[PDB]
């Protein structure tokens, strides 16, 4: 049984002085860690929204969270989607203008939380055209919360769809 516990990073808010472009319980950006023998490691962030726990499935891969002293157990998950639900329904429907700049919330492992301004790249889809944000963040920096103008989550870092 791995031991996953929940860490709180900071609060999930729009930042006007953020840094742009290129060059990279209650509620809030939380990191996914596991407990090893040589030391903890993060291996995924999450949202916390409504008190429902939002990540994405490979940080999890469904196993139960410890948050405090209680427990967390997923309501729902998509793996095909790469996102789990836990202790509530997805909460977040928030969608990207696909004609905006957004902020990614990054919490690299082992770095202070920072907003970062950057503009999704479009493709097309069967489904829809897609906005596509793609850094260079550690590995354990997915599920990161991305954002738009209006502080809204538009997406997890890791993929966000775009629906105007
Ligand atoms: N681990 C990265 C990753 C990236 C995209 C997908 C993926 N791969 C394929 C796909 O297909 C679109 C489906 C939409 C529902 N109907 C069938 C097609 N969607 C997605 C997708 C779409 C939205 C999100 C997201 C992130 C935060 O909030 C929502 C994450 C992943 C799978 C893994």
């Known amino acids: 049984m791995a031991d996953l516990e929940l860490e709180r990073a900071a609060d999930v808010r729009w930042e006007e002085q953020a840094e742009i472009s290129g060059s990279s319980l209650e509620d809030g950006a939380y990191r996914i860690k596991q407990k090893g023998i040589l030391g903890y490691s993060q291996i995924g962030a999450g949202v916390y929204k409504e008190g429902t726990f939002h ?17 967390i157990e997923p309501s729902w998950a998509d793996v095909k989607k790469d ?42 889809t069967n ?4 906005g596509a944000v793609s850094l260079d963040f550690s590995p ?25």
């Open 140 to 164: 354990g920096t997915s599920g990161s919360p991305i954002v738009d103008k209006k502080g809204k989550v538009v997406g997890l870092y890791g993929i966000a769809n775009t629906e105007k």
């Open 127 to 130: 489904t829809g055209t897609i």
């Open 55 to 71: 990540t994405m499935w490979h940080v999890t891969r469904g196993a139960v969270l410890m948050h405090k002293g209680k427990r």
């Open 83 to 124: 996102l789990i639900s836990y202790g509530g329904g997805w909460k977040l429907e928030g969608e990207w203008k696909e004609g905006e700049e957004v902020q990614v919330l990054a919490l690299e492992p082992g770095k202070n939380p920072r907003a970062v301004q950057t503009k999704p790249g479009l493709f097309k």
